[PDB]
Design a protein around this ligand. Structure first.
Ligand SMILES: Cc1cn([C@H]2CCCN(S(=O)(=O)c3ccc(O)c(Oc4cccc(Cl)c4)c3)C2)c(=O)[nH]c1=O
Ligand SMILES: Cc1cn([C@H]2CCCN(S(=O)(=O)c3ccc(O)c(Oc4cccc(Cl)c4)c3)C2)c(=O)[nH]c1=O
Lengths: 198, 196
């Protein structure tokens, strides 16, 4: 079994990369792809509170992402890993660390302690980081889909750099500045090399 | 202003004590009575998930009590304190520590770290612990099963460990006395604090 998470800011091509990689992996492995809340009812209900929120306090928001994470982990991830599956998860702990911790300003270590309570030692086996420059990311955002948004995008990227710097061995950084066909190939090859080594 | 929390297991006379102590403090203080979620919409929505849940994972439950606590703190407690109010809060951090931490078995220090994230340094100014024996507590519960009895005992045991740990904001009131005396001791303890 393998627990693989995918991380990156907006404009990293993450959605496209995960879907294409997953599609290729389904041929050779017992693999599932998911994201939080992922249809788990308690998680979907927590997510509705987050979306229905009016200027929600960032710590309440962090605690709700962490509660949704646990429900999804407990009801979807853990049962699949117990069946010997490769689990591909779109966003996990590192998303809370970069967005809530770094970009929102709660502090990475504080959001980590919160998330360690939620995951209870279930860290990913491998994390694919879709390493897109802020400039390429910005251009992908305007293309494929104000000024405060630009700075928030940069801080998310800066947040992911600090996370990798403090925990490199868990991470595999993929050049997301390349055309998406190449990002897909590099991500697939990185995963295959990991899966065939275990 | 003052943030005063009330802690204790069921059967400690907590409801009666808070209401009566509120009735006496209002003469001299701008005081409010509250409990989480306390009408805060986001908190009420979180509480509905907790109550509507079926065999919910204890850590998700702990994280939801902590999320409801923050919403209540941010939208009710803090604005009340800013107005100069005495805030009487029925259950706060120590309840998560005794119930989720100790009695449910997650571990007190783990639930503390979770709750320190939620309160972000906003510890109570004073915490009234209504120190009732399990036996007196049990009798008060029946007046107002084996698994329930054992859970009640573990909650009390949990509060003993918490009180043993931190000794500054905690004030232990003998809740084995008749309720009139528990009310008087609690009121006098609060007055001594508010005056000094
Ligand atoms: C998993 C995760 C995601 N994000 C963001 C990634 C980028 C998109 N945002 S968003 O607020 O625009 C958003 C987009 C789609 C959503 O569907 C959403 O709602 C939730 C998603 C997952 C879990 C929960 Cl509780 C809500 C929020 C979420 C965080 O800030 N922290 C996390 O832990
Ligand atoms: C504040 C608090 C209370 N409790 C319990 C105290 C005894 C009663 N229980 S209960 O689960 O039986 C319960 C009774 C009535 C309720 O109304 C309730 O729902 C909530 C109360 C406060 C906050 C939230 Cl999110 C739900 C739960 C909650 C905890 O276990 N942890 C805490 O942090």
């Amino acid at each position: 079994s393998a627990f693989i998470t995918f991380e990156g800011p907006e404009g990293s091509g993450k959605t496209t990369v995960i879907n294409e990689v997953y599609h290729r992996l389904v041929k050779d492995y017992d693999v599932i792809m998911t994201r939080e809340p992922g249809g788990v009812p308690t998680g979907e209900e927590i997510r509705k509170i987050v979306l229905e929120g009016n200027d929600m306090d960032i710590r309440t928001e962090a605690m709700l992402f962490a509660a949704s994470r646990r429900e999804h982990l407990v009801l979807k991830v853990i049962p699949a890993l117990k069946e010997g599956k490769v689990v591909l998860c779109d966003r996990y702990i590192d998303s809370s660390l970069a967005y809530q911790g770094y970009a929102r300003g709660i502090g990475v270590e504080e959001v980590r302690a919160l998330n360690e309570f939620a995951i209870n030692g279930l860290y990913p086996d491998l994390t694919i980081y879709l390493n897109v420059s802020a400039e390429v990311g910005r251009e992908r955002i305007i293309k494929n889909s104000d000024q405060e948004d630009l700075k928030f995008h940069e801080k998310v990227i800066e947040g992911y750099q600090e996370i990798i710097h403090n925990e490199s061995q868990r991470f595999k950084s993929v050049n997301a500045d390349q055309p998406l066909e190449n990002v897909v190939e590099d991500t697939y090859q990185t995963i295959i090399k990991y899966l065939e080594k275990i």
